[PDB]
Amino acid sequence: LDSRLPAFRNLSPAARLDHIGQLLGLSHDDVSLLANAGALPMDIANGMIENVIGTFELPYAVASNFQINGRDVLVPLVVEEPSIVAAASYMAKLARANGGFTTSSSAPLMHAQVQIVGIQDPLNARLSLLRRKDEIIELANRKDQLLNSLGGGCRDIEVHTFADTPRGPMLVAHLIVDVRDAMGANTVNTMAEAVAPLMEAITGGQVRLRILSNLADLRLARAQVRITPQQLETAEFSGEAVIEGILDAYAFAAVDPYRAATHNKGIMNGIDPLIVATGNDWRAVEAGAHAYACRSGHYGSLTTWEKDNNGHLVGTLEMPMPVGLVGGATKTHPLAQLSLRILGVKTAQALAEIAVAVGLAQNLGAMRALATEGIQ
Amino acid sequence: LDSRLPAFRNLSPAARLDHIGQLLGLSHDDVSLLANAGALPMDIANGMIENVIGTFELPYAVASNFQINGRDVLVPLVVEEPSIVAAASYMAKLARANGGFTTSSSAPLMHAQVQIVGIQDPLNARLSLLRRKDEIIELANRKDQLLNSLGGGCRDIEVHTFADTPRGPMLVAHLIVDVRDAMGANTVNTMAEAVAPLMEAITGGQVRLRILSNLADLRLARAQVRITPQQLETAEFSGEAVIEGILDAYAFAAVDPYRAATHNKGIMNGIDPLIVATGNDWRAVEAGAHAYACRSGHYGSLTTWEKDNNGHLVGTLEMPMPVGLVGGATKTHPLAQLSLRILGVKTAQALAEIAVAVGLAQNLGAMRALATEGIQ
Numbered sequence: 001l002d003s004r005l006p007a008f009r010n011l012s013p014a015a016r017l018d019h020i021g022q023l024l025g026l027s028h029d030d031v032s033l034l035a036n037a038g039a040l041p042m043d044i045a046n047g048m049i050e051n052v053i054g055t056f057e058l059p060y061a062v063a064s065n066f067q068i069n070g071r072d073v074l075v076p077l078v079v080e081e082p083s084i085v086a087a088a089s090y091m092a093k094l095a096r097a098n099g100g101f102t103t104s105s106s107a108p109l110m111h112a113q114v115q116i117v118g119i120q121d122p123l124n125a126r127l128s129l130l131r132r133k134d135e136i137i138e139l140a141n142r143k144d145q146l147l148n149s150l151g152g153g154c155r156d157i158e159v160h161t162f163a164d165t166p167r168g169p170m171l172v173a174h175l176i177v178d179v180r181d182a183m184g185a186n187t188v189n190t191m192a193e194a195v196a197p198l199m200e201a202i203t204g205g206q207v208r209l210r211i212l213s214n215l216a217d218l219r220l221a222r223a224q225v226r227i228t229p230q231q232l233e234t235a236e237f238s239g240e241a242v243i244e245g246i247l248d249a250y251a252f253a254a255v256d257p258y259r260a261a262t263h264n265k266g267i268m269n270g271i272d273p274l275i276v277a278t279g280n281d282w283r284a285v286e287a288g289a290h291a292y293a294c295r296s297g298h299y300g301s302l303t304t305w306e307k308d309n310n311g312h313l314v315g316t317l318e319m320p321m322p323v324g325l326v327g328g329a330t331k332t333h334p335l336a337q338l339s340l341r342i343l344g345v346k347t348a349q350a351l352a353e354i355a356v357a358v359g360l361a362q363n364l365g366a367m368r369a370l371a372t373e374g375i376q
Numbered sequence: 377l378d379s380r381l382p383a384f385r386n387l388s389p390a391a392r393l394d395h396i397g398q399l400l401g402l403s404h405d406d407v408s409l410l411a412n413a414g415a416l417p418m419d420i421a422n423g424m425i426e427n428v429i430g431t432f433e434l435p436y437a438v439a440s441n442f443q444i445n446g447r448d449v450l451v452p453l454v455v456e457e458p459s460i461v462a463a464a465s466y467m468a469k470l471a472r473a474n475g476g477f478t479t480s481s482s483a484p485l486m487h488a489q490v491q492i493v494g495i496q497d498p499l500n501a502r503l504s505l506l507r508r509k510d511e512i513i514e515l516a517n518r519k520d521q522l523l524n525s526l527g528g529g530c531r532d533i534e535v536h537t538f539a540d541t542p543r544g545p546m547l548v549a550h551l552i553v554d555v556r557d558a559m560g561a562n563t564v565n566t567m568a569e570a571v572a573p574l575m576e577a578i579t580g581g582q583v584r585l586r587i588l589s590n591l592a593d594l595r596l597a598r599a600q601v602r603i604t605p606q607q608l609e610t611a612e613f614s615g616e617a618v619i620e621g622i623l624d625a626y627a628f629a630a631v632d633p634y635r636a637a638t639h640n641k642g643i644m645n646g647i648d649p650l651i652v653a654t655g656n657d658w659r660a661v662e663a664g665a666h667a668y669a670c671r672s673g674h675y676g677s678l679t680t681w682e683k684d685n686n687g688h689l690v691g692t693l694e695m696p697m698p699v700g701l702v703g704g705a706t707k708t709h710p711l712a713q714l715s716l717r718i719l720g721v722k723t724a725q726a727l728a729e730i731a732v733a734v735g736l737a738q739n740l741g742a743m744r745a746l747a748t749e750g751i752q
């Protein structure tokens with residue numbers, strides 16, 4: 001696969017769609033999902049959410065030039081805002097010259113929280129739980145046979161205490177669950193509900209919340225990119241001075257939350273449209289991303305930008321990225337299935353890796369434009 | 377308008393649409409935009425973002441029972457996830473019994489950032505700017521005579537310094553701009569550009585970034601709700617016990633960022649689909665919401681929950697809410713226009729107020745469920 005797509009931006013939507021279909025070998029049926037409006041049947045839309053009266057369209061695009069660990073990929077994106085697809089594509093083009101994007105990710109581990117109140121001895125109860133870990137882990141894994149046989153399941157438990165709250169001391173257990181190719185909320189909510197009575201028996205507390213955490217900091221995905229000064233040279237500036245201006249923009253986001261919010265918004269301009277294109281939950285991804293940005297107590301940049309010893313501009317993105325290939329709209333929406341076909345992804349973590357590569361490219365594009373814009 | 381919609385949940389989408397059209401007095405043409413696929417023509421979609429190959433639908437729904445400052449409203453929502461619309465409607469039904477939602481908002485004030493580097497005397501340069509603030513403000517306002525006629529414009533400037541970054545001292549000016557019914561990005565960006573040469577003259581430094589901040593903490597919208605224990609009573613739980621359980625849930629969110637990220641995600645489940653339905657930029661709203669949530673130096677809850685002197689449950693949501701009635705896809709997308717007609721809003725701050733009421737409702741719905749039978 002060659003994702004360069006020369007001339008794409010100037011082709012008609014039909015000719016774009018034809019080129020995609022040729023490059024990938026999409027069937028006629030696949031192509032007709034995008035050629036004709038209304039690919040989401042109303043009977044399906046009506047079973048997705050409540051009180052449905054119709055459907056709402058956004059444009060569906062493809063970003064070009066992306067390459068992930070040496071493999072070319074085409075990236076579907078659904079969004080209303082201009083410049084995003086272009087910026088991504090152009091930074092992807094530049095990235096290719098130096099090997100594309102390099103990615104990695106954690107195992108697909110999600111937390112389930114079990115909140116326990118009204119214990120007079122929570123610190124002691126925490127050890128009583130930790131001692132009985134294996135028992136709790138076995139109970140968690142009893143019901144979801146499909147998950148286990150696919151090689152997922154509850155791996156471990158950690159327990160936290162919050163002894164100072166206005167509502168008294170709390171204990172909070174986390175089940176740590178490998179959810180394989182799912183986003184995982186239903187899987188872990190189920191397990192949290194299933195172990196709650198047993199934890200209550202061990203601790204003597206009242207269980208309250210039994211619920212996933214969206215701060216999915218054990219489900220991290222990572223991307224890297226490299227850009228050389230020669231690539232960034234403008235009419236106004238040397239490539240070197242552009243790099244320095246990109247580093248200046250980065251330091252500005254790292255110290256000022258007013259800038260960091262905007263900088264990170266730029267990252268999510270790249271990521272959220274992929275999430276939408278694949279039928280995934282963008283509120284989950286957003287909450288994980290921004291909560292992770294302020295894990296230190298200070299709201300900072302999710303990306304890093306540096307100059308290496310060769311003088312090259314090197315960027316990183318590492319962040320929570322809980323996404324699924326199965327479940328909900330990703331299965332039921334015909335175009336979500338088409339997107340996954342276009343992407344070629346075999347695991348949810350592969351989809352996560354593509355996401356962070358696009359977020360990183362979008363951030364770079366935004367910074368480059370802001371740094372190279374002349375003073376009027 | 378009566379927003380109650382008896383049996384709406386169980387009508388077909390065609391019947392729900394006909395019913396809305398009758399309540400609102402929508403034209404046959406308006407109803408047609410939802411009764412048929414393809415309300416977003418391809419020529420418009422192709423002009424909205426780059427590399428467009430088609431469109432992508434999500435379901436379009438309406439939440440029922442909402443009442444804001446004593447007026448019933450119907451709330452359009454576009455999203456892929458079940459239970460959101462139902463939960464919002466159900467909590468809105470409860471809220472009606474005690475007066476509905478009560479809302480307010482600030483003026484629609486946005487920050488434009490102007491980053492200045494290369495100054496050995498940033499603290500001095502700050503006072504030189506403030507000494508000449510009236511000129512800077514007059515200059516920003518020459519740039520947009522129409523906004524000023526509409527009753528907006530640059531109101532003030534603030535200046536922040538970061539004298540010790542790893543990239544050297546920086547100074548950052550903020551233009552504080554009343555943007556009326558726009559989200560405002562384009563307006564404030566334009567002003568930042570206009571004042572940049574003047575700030576360079578004053579400070580002797582070099583302007584880098586000129587750009588809005590999405591941390592729109594001078595554009596706050598606020599909602600309140602009240603719920604009695606009688607309303608929350610179940611077969612398994614007294615209403616008083618449910619209220620205690622909700623307060624335990626809130627305290628858990630206030631202390632633990634693992635919980636707060638999820639709690640806040642639930643609020644955004646309510647808000648973002650109204651943002652999408654109105655053609656607004658949901659990445660901006662998200663970034664502002666979650667960055668505001670950590671302004672204290674700890675990532676906490678956007679909502680508050682308390683029990684008043686009567687034993688009643690009272691909740692608040694105050695947050696940044698930068699949305700527009702004009703600008704971008706809000707104008708361009710025929711269904712964004714229709715949403716605004718359904719909502720009946722006459723200013724952007726009115727839309728913002730609706731948004732926080734729906735966010736507050738959604739949070740309440742999640743918590744009520746999590747404190748009683750559980751989410752599953």
Ligand SMILES: CC(C)(COP(=O)([O-])OP(=O)([O-])OC[C@H]1O[C@@H](n2cnc3c(N)ncnc32)[C@H](O)[C@@H]1OP(=O)([O-])[O-])[C@@H](O)C(=O)NCCC(=O)NCCSC(=O)C[C@@](C)(O)CC(=O)[O-]
Nearest residue numbers: 050051385459460462463465466638639642645741742745
């Ligand atoms: C989903 C409900 C409301 C069902 O509720 P129910 O148990 O079926 O109660 P009901 O069936 O008697 O419904 C009563 C009212 O709910 C509304 N309603 C009820 N069903 C529908 C429907 N199909 N379509 C439209 N409206 C509906 C409707 O207004 C109805 O009034 P009535 O029928 O008496 O006039 C209930 O189970 C509930 O409130 N669940 C909330 C939990 C939830 O799933 N919230 C949604 C978002 S998930 C989320 O935010 C993530 C989370 C939870 O992790 C955030 C966090 O942790 O904080």
